[PDB]
Amino acid sequence: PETLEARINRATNPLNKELDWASINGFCEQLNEDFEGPPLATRLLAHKIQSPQEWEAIQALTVLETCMKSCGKRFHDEVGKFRFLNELIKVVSPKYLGSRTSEKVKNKILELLYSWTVGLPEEVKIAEAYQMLKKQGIV
Amino acid sequence: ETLEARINRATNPLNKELDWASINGFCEQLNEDFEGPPLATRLLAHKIQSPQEWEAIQALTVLETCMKSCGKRFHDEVGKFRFLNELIKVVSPKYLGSRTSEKVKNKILELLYSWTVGLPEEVKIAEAYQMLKKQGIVKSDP
Amino acid sequence: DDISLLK
Amino acid sequence: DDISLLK
């Protein structure tokens, strides 16, 4: 019920008629209290973000965007690692899942990556990845 | 009811037990449309690669069931590398293999093998399975 | 169509 | 503790 998997399953539920902030916020807060919380979150998020069901991926991206705003280095570092960024690159790059992914889900990933390269220049890997997608003509 | 709606209930992590009503319902519906088979395999591949064991496991029971129920329409779709590659990434160390539960990995290997026998015409399945066998991922027929 | 076997 | 950027 309070486990990350149960929270993410509610926050990114394909059935939700509208964003569920309670569950999304609860999810961000729940990860900020565990040394293993962040790694498990990014892993669970990469999966949801890659779902063929657009409303599932959009809500997962909404969760990623939200937790990045209210979290420390613990989660900011997990997203900064290529271990996570690659899963996003996979979703927007046609060379992988890019061709079958909704333009909406792709654009949102690109807004986030940019938003982070600006508000978090520290995370070089995020910028480094964002740059590659830009030179690659994907942006 | 859509395939997505069906698959989401058949592989729901909250299920206290297998939901045969939804599992079989998904196999019945994927054939009611000429677009279903290719779409069902993409939905299953995504569920099968879920970090949530109970989700990937139910998904494998769904894949298993549809293989027995449906005919060549679906058999051909599972028999393409477009889908077999997704199963290989789950059990091959070169990919998600390391980060995947032995329960799920062994389940995939059992199904892969059970198809080489029940559906020998699907040359792709046998080629994929044979590779896993020479790479070590499969020491013997389960 | 279909893609090639994964390595 | 991390992987290489997807080529």
CA distance A16 to chain D (A): 33
Domain boundaries, chain A: 1-139
Contact A69, A27 (CB under 8 A): no
Option in A5, A51, A52 nearest B52 (CB) = A5
| Count of C-beta atoms within a 10 Å radius of residue A14 | 16
Best residue of A74, A83, A123 to probe chain D, by most D CBs closer than 10 Å: A83
Domain A1-139 fold is 1.25.40
Q: With an 8 Å Cβ cutoff, are A89 and D1 in contact?
A: no
Rounded to an integer, what distance in angstroms lies between the CA atom of residue B72 and that of residue B61? Answer: 19
Q: Which of A38, A29, A7, A32 is nearest to A20 (CA)?
A: A7
Cα angle for residues A10, A16, A22 (degrees, 5° grid): 50
Contact B88, B132 (CB under 8 A): yes
Rounded to an integer, what distance in angstroms lies between the CA atom of residue A116 and that of residue B34? Answer: 43
Its sign, for the CA torsion A15, A104, A138, C5, is positive
Written as one string, the DSSP assignment of B9-30 is HHT-TT-SS--HHHHHHHHHHT
Q: Is D7 on the interface with A (CB under 8 A)?
A: no
- Chains within contact range of chain B (3+ C-beta pairs < 8 Å): A, C
Q: With an 8 Å Cβ cutoff, are B81 and C7 in contact?
A: no
Contact B48, B86 (CB under 8 A): yes
Chain B residues at the A interface, defined by Cβ less than 8 Å, are 4-5, 8, 13-14, 42-43, 46, 49-52, 99
Q: Which two tokens stand for residue A126?
A: 């995020």
| Count of C-beta atoms within a 10 Å radius of residue B82 | 18
Q: Which of D3, B8, B41 is nearest to A100 (CA)?
A: B41
Helix or strand run (H / E) with residue A75: helix A73-80
Contacts of A51 in chain B (CB under 8 A): 46
Rounded to an integer, what distance in angstroms lies between the CA atom of residue B76 and that of residue B120? Answer: 12
Helix, strand, or coil (residue B103):
helix
Pseudo-torsion of CA A50, A56, A57, A62, nearest 10°? -150
Using a 10 angstrom Cβ sphere, with 0-12 exposed, 13-18 middle and 19 or more buried, the burial of residue D1 is exposed
CA distance B26 to chain A (A): 16
Its sign, for the CA torsion A66, A54, B49, A124, is negative
Rounded to an integer, what distance in angstroms lies between the CA atom of residue B66 and that of residue B74? Answer: 8
Question: Which residues contact residue B60 at a Cβ distance below 8 angstroms, ignoring those fewer than 6 apart?
Answer: B48, B104, B107, B108, B111
Method of determination is X-ray
In the chain, the amino acid numbered B123 is V
Rounded to an integer, what distance in angstroms lies between the CA atom of residue A25 and that of residue B8? Answer: 23
| Count of C-beta atoms within a 10 Å radius of residue B140 | 6
CATH code reported for the domain at B1-142: 1.25.40.90
Contact B3, B36 (CB under 8 A): yes
Best residue of A36, A45, A53, A97 to probe chain B, by most B CBs closer than 10 Å: A53
Q: Which residue has the tokens 């892969």?
A: B112
Contacts of A96 in chain D (CB under 8 A): 6
Q: Which of C3, C7, A102 is nearest to B83 (CA)?
A: C3
| Count of C-beta atoms within a 10 Å radius of residue A107 | 12
Helix, strand, or coil (residue A74):
helix
Rounded to an integer, what distance in angstroms lies between the CA atom of residue B112 and that of residue A137? Answer: 39
Written as one string, the DSSP assignment of B68-96 is HHS-HHHHHHHTSHHHHHHHHHHH-TTTG
Rounded to an integer, what distance in angstroms lies between the CA atom of residue B60 and that of residue B46? Answer: 11
CA distance D2 to chain A (A): 6
For this entry, resolution in Å reads 2.6
